């Protein structure tokens, strides 16, 4: 598994609050990060998962947790989806475009016969170590609350090593 | 990741309710399965992840879901752990022993430098397809409630394809 | 080089006049085909290259020529772009999505460090033979009228060998 | 593709306005270049494609654009063809001979079964980068006027980068 | 075989008299060692091979010989076994846990299709040299007396080279 | 290890009671066998180990156990050692000559830098499976009695599978 | 050396006084053939090597010998040269064009650096065997006469096998 | 073709009228050299190819040209033949023996099947460049005269670089 | 070694009593053979080694033993040497020429730096098996009489297998 | 082939006139050496080849020539054979044991399917160059007198180059 391994370098374009920015692993150093992968923009299914996370963004930003959603679509596709869907409109975190598939492959999360990323979520600590991984098939939603619980538990463990039980 | 792939064949010994049985993939066919991996028997750590799943074992069974916990310890170690801890005593589902690590590796869940499996839960459908994967570092904890919600969502989706919110 | 070579097999989803369909090389057998690749949907560059081919579409259908535009975006992105841009809404031909990049790599037309296809147009005959190729860097536009000319000429040649 | 790649070093003999010269990639550096390949000298083929580029040469020169025609024939063959054909005689640009096939292969444009180059045109910028490619089958025809439009467009873009759509 | 080669470096956790310690090759330097490998803790089999060695542990210690039993179970499993069986309770020497199987493999003693070590005893001298090797199938049994005789012969031979019967 | 593995084919010349015979794995099928390796004939150390075994030969033959001693010396060397040493003279079992080293390598028992076999003893059952292995450095003798005990225990286990304890 | 080996198959377009034809190894089968290679058409070098062969063409055709000139130029280039040079217009044999260079390479006669064949002459018997080779650097000429003497003697040995001395 | 390439280094024993010498590429440096190859000594074939070269030897030595005959026989074989054949005794140039076949192979002139060189003649300028090659099958002869004409013309181009037409 | 190995197929031209013949491994089958290699024909070297084998040829023939001398020289060179030397002229056995070096290499006896075979003698039995080998440096000398003793011994052993020591 | 090649380095134990010694190539440097290989100790074949070399031993020592017999048996087997056979007891030169077969393989003289060396003799000069080789199948004996002759001749040649 990738559990307990260090994320790999990357450099991608992203759409964040009306602006196009460049994101690299440098931007994640010293921070808690959530890499939220999904297959494709503009599909016919409502983006509730991406919306759930947007609903907890403020609380996540309070926890010092940056959020990066990722699909193999471009940041141009992301900008357009943001201004055409009420749910995606709520998104304030960075929406990374990964058309080369490199970020997705770094996380071993590519459906090679589709060129689309699987529904996986990765929690990465300040040293770049993956502490939690969640992957689900279509239809099985990822609960943003449970994600919050894990990130809080992970942050605790980092501050209280040796959770005596 | 292994999401959406078919589980690989396996043959392991296990301890289930005072008995030693053999478990293979044939045992999972036609059924929903949860494979619950943990690092080591007799560990000072809160056997909290194993007990909570034992608690919801009633519901799971109502839903036609079989449960298998797995560690690189042997079934003999499982039997002994079962009759030495009250928390582990509640377990009525099979406790698989994976000393060769083949089951753990089939699910790409081995901590190679420790010879112990990582804390991971897998949901497998009746056709052997992995529908949900969860892996966490020590101390983070897997919520058996969120698991139940996922299983029911997986079952719902298998019965009613295409009934998700329209954009 | 690809000139005078046969196109490779492919299977991709596309958006065509309101519907999602599957397109494969078998759909080109016995027909004249134009594969029009471009970089990305929704960019700030003038959608003029795609819209102009659309203007000449009815005429191309009259000559028995099918048109397929291709980008590494999905057919979902294409549908969205088609209903949000007026120039793209004019498109009645198939907009192929190539997220795996296989169709693009078949025509050796991928910018590997971007994951986007280069601006290239290919003219393919009924036997699957590429008779014309045009590739341009960004900012240099492809002329639909010149494409039309080359297509009519390709057809003449086919019907009147040597001259 | 070769699109957006830098041309490769080369050294060939060429016929240009009565004299024999030697062309290398050094001559193209810092200039806009058009490499116009064709199959063979002395062919029934309506030399209309080469003669038409000649018709735009004066304007091309005025824009800083050199032109080189290339065939796998020798520069000797080019001299001869240039004196026996009225269309070819209108040519004032260099006529490169590529009998080793090297130049043609650098541009991946050899018909390996015939030993002749395919009908292709390449626009190369001052830094050696290919900005436009065009290849056509026998009898289809390249439009010198469209070539001109492409060149102006490329020159325009080199000067005004990131020209968004108004 | 490994006869006459130097043991390889290793780092394992162990259980020794109610404590968890770390054992490495540095621990064996300058000492005589017996590495006693067995297949699995909590096994119904006569813990007879492990108890007899515990009995002669007194003499061995008189001779400056350290003892280490090893199985692919963890130290946690060893602790539990130690406080659940009277026979295993007699053990006062280190019980090494080898879940990664690296120690077992260093001594080329792994049953690969079981993930369990074979019944093997190794005698290692102060310089790390393997002087005696014994491996037996299940049911055959290793005699701790013959072991003692070998160790004393190995010690005698190290102190008095060349004093063997003349032909 | 070689424990629980099947012996490999071999074909060697041997010296047995005044005669030269050929031994192959065929001769071991259906029988219990002991392969007793030693480094070299005619050395200056008394062959007590080979003699101990000769002392128990009769009892071993009663148990249906064939004995084959082995060194990389020839059967010619063996014949000569037999008629020149009182201890080796007592030997009635076959003394295999292995100058090619093939039998010794089959049992992974060659000291490659010496061309001599190590002091190893292998107990093989009727199906050709190795059930016991004993290897010792020079000076540490192999006790023929303990060998008898193991062979008897191994023969028991074969007749009473599942030694309930 | 290719001396005494059999020519390799080939198919080339050629110009034979007025029209375009295709020459193959078949055209040579059961016939004496002379392959005359030269570097390039329309060259400032006096075609004395090509025209001098033409002169002996009548005598050659009588002996049952065909002539093929060969250069890496095309047959189109050949027709043009045959109409702009008196020396060349004298040619009645086939002028083979070899732009792929396969014919030249079949005879290992290519100046890989220039993509032009060297000045070489070959004599091939009816069975396709090369009986005489001649190569010269630009300047040293190839004797028309000598070529004839060679062919004559070559043909003698043809009917009268080795005439010992 | 080896035409226009530089000869390769070589060291061979040779017989030059009466004595044994060693020839090297050095002996050729700054000198016009002619390498005359033939299949074998003491052959039933009339040495008209070797003796006829001898005749023009005086004229050749005048032009500053050396002659080396070459066969895969040894120099010992050469001395013997030079004393049992009038035609051969006429030879005053060096008769190189090439039993290893390196000299012949340097000139790609070996009949690998017979281990004998082919009937070939080479002209090498002072800079070591081969200017003329000639190979013939047994029967077709090599013209002494022609060889001379070649050398003469070859030397003209030497001082008077390319004399355009 | 080559000792106890079967000779390899071969085909060479040889000079034998005035005529040119062709020898192949077929001729050695069912016979006892001696392959006597030497460096070169016409050498100052005292032809004493070859002449001495000649001296025993009559007896060798009487025992069913053919002899073949081999050098990398041609069979032509052998004819000549045979007529100009009184020692060589005493030879009635085949003189094989091995200019390709093949035969010599089959017996792994080529001095690769000289293109000449080393001074070696091989005794080959009716089944093609090499029973005796002898190689010596220049100037050491092979004894034809010892060769004879070896051959008789080999013939004796082929007839009386396993001749223990009385 | 090995003729005119230099012997390879080796290190082996031997029995020599009552003692066990170590022999290496360094012991041959600057001396004339005879390596006499044979199959096996204690066989039923007549020990005549070894005993005859022994008869010529004093003379060989007089010429500055060392003799080493070699078999794949150990030096222990050699000692035993030397004290049990009268023909072998005559041996005063070194009897090398080659159980690893390395010395034998150096001289490419091993019968791989038997693990015994072939009957071969090599004459080595002070510079380690093999000047003479003789190999024979079983039953065909090697003559010590002829060996002596070749050795004296090898020496002449060394002292009088060309003649």
Curated annotation (Swiss-Prot), chains A, F, G, H:
Enzyme Commission code(s) on record: 1.11.1.26
Catalysed reactions, as listed in the record: a hydroperoxide + NADH + H(+) = an alcohol + NAD(+) + H2O
GO MF annotation, one: NADH-dependent peroxiredoxin activity
BP terms from Gene Ontology: cell redox homeostasis; hydrogen peroxide catabolic process; response to oxidative stress
A Gene Ontology cellular-component term: cytosol
Localization: Cytoplasm
Signal peptide residue numbers: none
Domain of life of the source: Bacteria
Domain Thioredoxin residues, every copy: 1-156
Keywords: Antioxidant, Cytoplasm, Disulfide bond, Oxidoreductase, Peroxidase, Redox-active center
Quaternary organization: Homodimer; disulfide-linked, upon oxidation. 5 homodimers assemble to form a ring-like decamer.
Assigned protein family: Belongs to the peroxiredoxin family. AhpC/Prx1 subfamily.
Protein name: Alkyl hydroperoxide reductase C
């Amino acid at each position: 598994s990738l559990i307990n391994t260090k994320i790999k370098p990357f450099k991608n374009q992203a759409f964040k609050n009306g602006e196009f920015i460049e994101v690299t692993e440098k931007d994640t150093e010293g921070r808690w990060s959530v890499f939220f992968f999904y297959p494709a923009d503009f599909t016919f299914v409502c983006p509730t998962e991406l919306g759930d996370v947007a609903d907890h963004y403020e609380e996540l930003q309070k926890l010092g947790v940056d959020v990066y959603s990722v699909s193999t679509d471009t940041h141009f596709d992301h900008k357009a989806w943001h201004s055409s869907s009420e749910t995606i409109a709520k998104i304030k975190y960075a929406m990374i475009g990964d058309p080369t598939g490199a970020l997705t492959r770094n996380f071993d999360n590519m459906r090679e016969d589709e060129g689309l990323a699987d529904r996986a979520t990765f929690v990465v600590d300040p040293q770049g170590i993956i502490q939690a991984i969640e992957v689900t098939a279509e239809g099985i939603g990822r609960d943003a609350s449970d994600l919050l619980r894990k990130i809080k538990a992970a942050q605790y463990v980092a501050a209280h090593p040796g959770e005596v039980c």
